[PDB]
Design an enzyme around this catalytic site. Structure first.
Site, short mmCIF file in Angstrom:
data_model
loop_
_atom_site.label_atom_id
_atom_site.label_comp_id
_atom_site.label_asym_id
_atom_site.label_seq_id
_atom_site.Cartn_x
_atom_site.Cartn_y
_atom_site.Cartn_z
N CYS A 161 -4.17 -19.06 -21.41
CA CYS A 161 -4.80 -18.98 -20.11
C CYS A 161 -3.88 -18.16 -19.20
O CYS A 161 -4.34 -17.32 -18.42
CB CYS A 161 -5.00 -20.39 -19.54
SG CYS A 161 -3.60 -21.45 -19.71
N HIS A 165 1.95 -24.43 -13.55
CA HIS A 165 0.70 -24.76 -14.23
C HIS A 165 0.32 -26.21 -14.21
O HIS A 165 1.18 -27.08 -14.32
CB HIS A 165 0.85 -24.26 -15.66
CG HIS A 165 -0.43 -24.17 -16.43
ND1 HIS A 165 -1.19 -25.28 -16.74
CD2 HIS A 165 -1.03 -23.13 -17.06
CE1 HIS A 165 -2.19 -24.93 -17.52
NE2 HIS A 165 -2.12 -23.62 -17.73
N1 LIG Z 1 -7.00 -26.62 -20.99
C1 LIG Z 1 -6.76 -25.37 -20.68
O1 LIG Z 1 -6.40 -25.09 -19.55
C2 LIG Z 1 -6.70 -24.33 -21.83
C3 LIG Z 1 -6.48 -24.64 -23.18
N2 LIG Z 1 -6.43 -23.61 -24.15
C4 LIG Z 1 -6.22 -23.85 -25.60
O2 LIG Z 1 -7.39 -24.39 -26.21
C5 LIG Z 1 -7.02 -25.30 -27.26
C6 LIG Z 1 -7.50 -26.70 -27.00
O3 LIG Z 1 -7.04 -27.06 -25.71
P1 LIG Z 1 -7.80 -28.10 -24.77
O4 LIG Z 1 -9.28 -28.02 -24.87
O5 LIG Z 1 -7.19 -27.78 -23.48
O6 LIG Z 1 -7.40 -29.53 -25.34
P2 LIG Z 1 -8.15 -30.85 -25.87
O7 LIG Z 1 -7.21 -31.76 -26.58
O8 LIG Z 1 -8.90 -31.33 -24.67
O9 LIG Z 1 -9.11 -30.17 -26.97
C7 LIG Z 1 -8.70 -30.18 -28.34
C8 LIG Z 1 -9.82 -30.78 -29.15
O10 LIG Z 1 -9.66 -30.50 -30.54
C9 LIG Z 1 -10.38 -31.57 -31.10
N3 LIG Z 1 -10.05 -31.70 -32.50
C10 LIG Z 1 -8.81 -31.83 -32.98
N4 LIG Z 1 -8.82 -31.65 -34.31
C11 LIG Z 1 -10.11 -31.47 -34.58
C12 LIG Z 1 -10.62 -31.23 -35.85
N5 LIG Z 1 -9.79 -31.09 -36.88
N6 LIG Z 1 -11.96 -31.09 -35.95
C13 LIG Z 1 -12.75 -31.20 -34.88
N7 LIG Z 1 -12.26 -31.39 -33.65
C14 LIG Z 1 -10.93 -31.52 -33.47
C15 LIG Z 1 -9.82 -32.76 -30.38
O11 LIG Z 1 -10.63 -33.90 -30.62
P3 LIG Z 1 -9.96 -35.32 -30.33
O12 LIG Z 1 -9.66 -35.47 -28.89
O13 LIG Z 1 -10.98 -36.30 -31.09
O14 LIG Z 1 -8.48 -35.43 -31.01
C16 LIG Z 1 -9.93 -32.28 -28.95
O15 LIG Z 1 -11.23 -32.69 -28.51
C17 LIG Z 1 -5.53 -25.19 -27.35
O16 LIG Z 1 -5.36 -24.09 -28.28
C18 LIG Z 1 -5.10 -24.82 -25.93
O17 LIG Z 1 -3.79 -24.21 -25.79
C19 LIG Z 1 -6.59 -22.28 -23.78
C20 LIG Z 1 -6.87 -22.00 -22.44
C21 LIG Z 1 -6.94 -23.01 -21.47
#
Ligand SMILES: NC(=O)C1=CN([C@@H]2O[C@H](COP(=O)(O)OP(=O)(O)OC[C@H]3O[C@@H](n4cnc5c(N)ncnc54)[C@H](OP(=O)(O)O)[C@@H]3O)[C@@H](O)[C@H]2O)C=CC1
Ligand SMILES: *O[C@@H]1[C@H](O)[C@@H](COP(=O)(O)OP(=O)(O)OC[C@H]2O[C@@H](n3cnc4c(N)ncnc43)[C@H](OP(=O)(O)O)[C@@H]2O)O[C@H]1N1C=CCC(C(N)=O)=C1
Ligand SMILES: *O[C@@H]1[C@H](O)[C@@H](COP(=O)(O)OP(=O)(O)OC[C@H]2O[C@@H](n3cnc4c(N)ncnc43)[C@H](OP(=O)(O)O)[C@@H]2O)O[C@H]1N1C=CCC(C(N)=O)=C1
Ligand SMILES: NC(=O)C1=CN([C@@H]2O[C@H](COP(=O)(O)OP(=O)(O)OC[C@H]3O[C@@H](n4cnc5c(N)ncnc54)[C@H](OP(=O)(O)O)[C@@H]3O)[C@@H](O)[C@H]2O)C=CC1
Lengths: 334, 334, 334, 334
Positions: free
Chosen positions: C151, C178
């Site tokens: 981001c 951040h």
């Molecule tokens: N938040 C932000 O500001 C930003 C985040 N990102 C990037 O995006 C990615 C995710 O971040 P973010 O959304 O913020 O975090 P979250 O933890 O909110 O999202 C990650 C998700 O991955 C899901 N998950 C994990 N393993 C699996 C799997 N094997 N199969 C299916 N679903 C799975 C998790 O589910 P569960 O919770 O059930 O474990 C969780 O819902 C990272 O790479 C992060 O650096 C990039 C830009 C911005």
């Protein structure tokens, strides 16, 4: 259609303005007394950490704000009497400054030429106080000063009224877990209330609530049957009332809920509401109703003790009612 | 003197360790199962956003932590059975991982060689659960697995017991405005509880509490007389219980308070306490008692309906009891 | 028109979905792999402590969600390979789970039948990473796995590129203040990063950032010219980058700003923006641009050292780019 | 030994009092002008959401507070001139009210009979301002009014001085991510600063800082070489300065750190400090030094651009210096 002037452009002052902005065919906000300034007025009206950026062309007219289209005169004077109400011909003054809540103080507006004054809070004693959806019909156009009660009293009254009607409230106590407000300190500082004097975002702050005894004003039958406390917690807006009342007719939660859902669909459509969703604070932000019953939480213990948990957006919901009550004032002559 | 092993070095695990560190002449914490690592263990033990920097020489011994003087073996394995309890000769296992709270799961420790297991929470069903200052005397050294109840049940039981004794609790409902905890989400994410799934520091999160029905375990006379809910709010530690109970003997707040102050000075000296000070959350941080009655708030409505507001440091206070209960275990053979 | 599948229905997963929902004529999100469940999926999609309640008819289809009209198949399996991509015929997989960011891991989708994979973060090494408005044109439809950077890298790159073009960046350091994110702990717990292991809402958490070196990927000319750190602070969304760069051509703030405003209206219209308003975090929530320059703060010290402060909505802004990049993928062949 | 009077019993006023309480053999705080009251004074001194409950027997003497032993006269009058300084014979007045920072305003104390005035902030123009560990030696006992600079200037100066001495600061910019303070609004309200006017716990609030130009006062050699901004964030106390300076002699982080550690152990032992620990905000609460360098973060980019990140407890640390500076005042004559 009804010349309205806003004294005190703070949380409710600004919420009110935005609440009717959208209302369909109201009264007419023509002036704003913002101790601040024209600049401060439009900036804080356009930007809101809680309400979000105002979706409207809010500009400056050299010496008054201007919303998508309209020009609102902006004036500044903390001495209500020196206000142009008379000269401009102000009919209603939305007294949301929180300092003129007694007959005397609020009366200053009157003597500046304003016709009625609608205190955006609990009136101090000799003041008619109405809660829309509970006792608004007892309003007289001969009322020189009105009180729209507190935010908590507006959330509480409606479902209380229903509770009393259908089951007979014998007596009870309510506890409100309420968001912090301008009245609290950001950091330990001086406050008449030594509890409120403490950092708002860091503690759970116990504090007195009038809402309990206030319900009795709008619902005479509950005189001396209630009382409670407030617990200010680390959240900007949206609060919750926890009412425990011992009733006359034995009951069960599902039955209590249903009762709320009749009223919600009938005499309180728009005031009371009943949510069956597993929501939390935030989810209730920007709700137009005075009170939303959290069905999933209703509990009846001992066939007579009923616990009710209702949500309310103390800023927006209340401002909506202030708009509503003003509209009424408008409908009843002047 | 009694070989203790801590399984789960989290909030209570670390609090416990620090709670007795200072205790005067306890048992003997010789091992720590921190899924994390030796590094993580001493760092998080020395630094605490809530407890403050640990006033002690906390170092690393290559493969185990070391506090001002002592070396505690540090081990990591999330499968309790593969733990050295047997080999080391662990007598008591402070099960604070929050995953092994049922007879089966907690039993893993036993089969790894541990003698007793003290679940740092509500046991799952077939488990003796005691609350110091309420029913700890019913403890048998033949109890293979113990439960020190919840943080809320420990704060609630003591003054409830007093309330029942002196006035006769007919039935009531409690509401706990509780700080957020590791169980909640920092930001909207997956949780079995869709309410807990919501951002903890942003909302007031309704959620189920067992504490109500749990009181009945430690105080049989209240079986089926209570029930309540929890409201998680934006604060790290220190919570508050709001109990409304309809009693047998007519009473008044001042009288209820006095009753709490006898017990506070007598049978509960060290468990219950009564504050007459206008304090707020923070002020109760690091208190060793299970429950502090906020005298200024006690309310009796209708000569039978009593409202009580008690504070509790869910982390420290509870950990203190866990230390206490362990000490007992120690005093009753092994 | 392009069959899209969302793996990981978290912050970005859900933001992405909502970001295009509104987009005018995209690709086609037909599936969602939410480890959670259908229930959790629609609930967390409808309610957002940060985004607000989703203005759409989000229901449940027995075994998949349904938005105002559409049905999206919902599947759950944390092992990408066991996913129906092949069978359903998934073209693009929005890899927003944050666990499959390396060629190997992300490759699992491919082998489940998915055609391309668009990692919603930084790719792990051997992965083409593009930033829309900087190097998106170098995209090849023969790219099996893409990275939309971080981001912070998306906020930084655009105005950096401009800075380099017009003034010649010699070398500099950036610091990003951040918001906290799922990666941090609500309360002191285990984290690989002992700083991130600390309570998110209570501290200012220094942490390492790749964004600095990452800019070099999308802007080769800056290879080895930058570096910085991140400071996680007590806010849910919307962050800010503080870039200090020593340039080639002497300059003054007003000149730097104009340069940004030039590009903002040209090659970066929609990516870069320049605010002259005295706004704060919240005011930038839900902004579609990757970066908004805070003109009022631009500072040039010593005729060559330029300080720039740009805002970014790490959730929404980035999600908007992910949508954008996907659209591109959609426009260059399959 | 030196009769001290505290005007303004707020954050610093109270911190100062508690800072010397413990100091070993100071001056003598005999009076307190707390616009509040005797009650408010002892209560807010005993309880602190940030400092913790005061470990001292703080009572009320009918009309003045009393700490574990001592009685401090408490007076209230917001008009400095009407204060008893003369009659009581006040030598030094710790001007921590934040309203009398100009020669004129602060001069009111003098004319009430006070001898010197030590402004607990930046002096307004014609005022000698000293930073202990930087230019305190230039203090003259003929100085009628002193300024102990800002909290940020005290954190910045010390390591800046070292940086200048050992490497030759050509020019640079600093950014301070600072906790919120009484000056900010809890919720969107009126403030001269429209950014500070915004809710403190909800946003990252950019705001102007003088500290940059202020360093030049205490370190003449840096006149016109620095400048920066402040970013107020959601935390009660403890801030951090991010200094980027381009130096004369090429260097590397490890070298810069050593330089700091050299001075930390020598001329600044007690003012500057260097932490190699992965700490966060909270960990620095209640630190007596003016500045703690976070070694792990020092970065040198381009052999001349040095980035330094230092922590400071704006309340306690600064208060410690105010005590220190007062002590000096006490040591150089009357
Ligand atoms: N938040 C932000 O500001 C930003 C985040 N990102 C990037 O995006 C990615 C995710 O971040 P973010 O959304 O913020 O975090 P979250 O933890 O909110 O999202 C990650 C998700 O991955 C899901 N998950 C994990 N393993 C699996 C799997 N094997 N199969 C299916 N679903 C799975 C998790 O589910 P569960 O919770 O059930 O474990 C969780 O819902 C990272 O790479 C992060 O650096 C990039 C830009 C911005
Ligand atoms: O209980 C409250 C109270 O009765 C009233 C105001 O509450 P609000 O929440 O809006 O607080 P605020 O943001 O501080 O607004 C008060 C403004 O009054 C302005 N002001 C003070 N004195 C004057 C004078 N004399 N003349 C003009 N303006 C004046 C203040 O200006 P400053 O900030 O410059 O001091 C403030 O702008 O509404 C009640 N209330 C009822 C329901 C819900 C509710 C809520 N916030 O949830 C509040
Ligand atoms: O109700 C709670 C619960 O029963 C228990 C733990 O609560 P706590 O508040 O300490 O939460 P935490 O900080 O998450 O601590 C849990 C730790 O367990 C460790 N862990 C999980 N699984 C293992 C296994 N299998 N083996 C070793 N360690 C393990 C976790 O480690 P990770 O973070 O690496 O996942 C955590 O460190 O105590 C109860 N409770 C009762 C009273 C008061 C109270 C409070 N916080 O106020 C909690
Ligand atoms: N907080 C910090 O981190 C630091 C603050 N400072 C500086 O110290 C000063 C005060 O700041 P701070 O303590 O933080 O803020 P506070 O607002 O907490 O303290 C200011 C105090 O001045 C009192 N006061 C105002 N006018 C009078 C008066 N005329 N007579 C008697 N008392 C009066 C106020 O009383 P009341 O509340 O009744 O209005 C308030 O208690 C400012 O100059 C600030 O910049 C310097 C270093 C650190």
């Amino acid at each position: 259609k009804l010349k309205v002037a806003i004294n005190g452009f703070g949380r409710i002052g600004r919420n009110f303005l935005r609440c009717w902005h959208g209302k369909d065919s109201p009264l007419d906000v023509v002036v704003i007394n913002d101790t601040g300034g024209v600049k401060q007025a439009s900036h804080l009206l356009k930007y809101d950490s809680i309400l979000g950026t105002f979706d409207a062309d809010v500009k400056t007219a050299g010496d008054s704000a201007i919303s998508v289209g309209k020009v609102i005169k902006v004036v500044s004077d903390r001495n209500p009497v020196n206000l142009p109400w008379g000269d401009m011909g102000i009919d209603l003054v939305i007294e949301g400054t929180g300092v003129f809540v007694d007959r005397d103080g609020a009366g200053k507006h009157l003597q500046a030429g304003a016709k009625k004054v609608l205190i955006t809070a609990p009136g101090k004693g000799d003041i008619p106080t109405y809660v829309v959806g509970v006792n608004e019909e007892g309003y007289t156009h001969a009322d020189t000063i009105i009180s729209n009660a507190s935010c908590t009293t507006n959330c509480l009254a409606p479902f209380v009224k229903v509770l009393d009607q259908k089951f007979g409230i014998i007596k009870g106590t309510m506890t409100t877990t309420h968001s912090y407000t301008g009245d609290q300190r950001l950091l330990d500082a001086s406050h008449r209330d030594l509890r409120r004097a403490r950092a708002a975002c860091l503690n759970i702050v116990p504090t007195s609530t009038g809402a309990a005894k206030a319900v009795a004003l709008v619902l005479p039958q509950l005189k001396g049957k209630l009382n409670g406390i407030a617990l200010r917690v680390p959240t900007p807006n949206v609060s919750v009332v926890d009412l425990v009342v011992q009733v006359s007719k034995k009951t069960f939660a599902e039955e209590v809920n249903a009762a709320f859902r009749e009223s919600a669909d009938q005499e309180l459509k728009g005031i009371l509401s009943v949510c069956d969703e597993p929501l939390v604070s935030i989810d209730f932000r920007c709700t137009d109703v005075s009170s939303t019953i959290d069905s999933s939480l209703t509990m009846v213990m001992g066939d007579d003790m009923v616990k009710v948990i209702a949500w309310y957006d103390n800023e927006w919901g209340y401002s909506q009612r202030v708009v509503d009550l003003a509209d009424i004032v408008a409908n009843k002559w002047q």
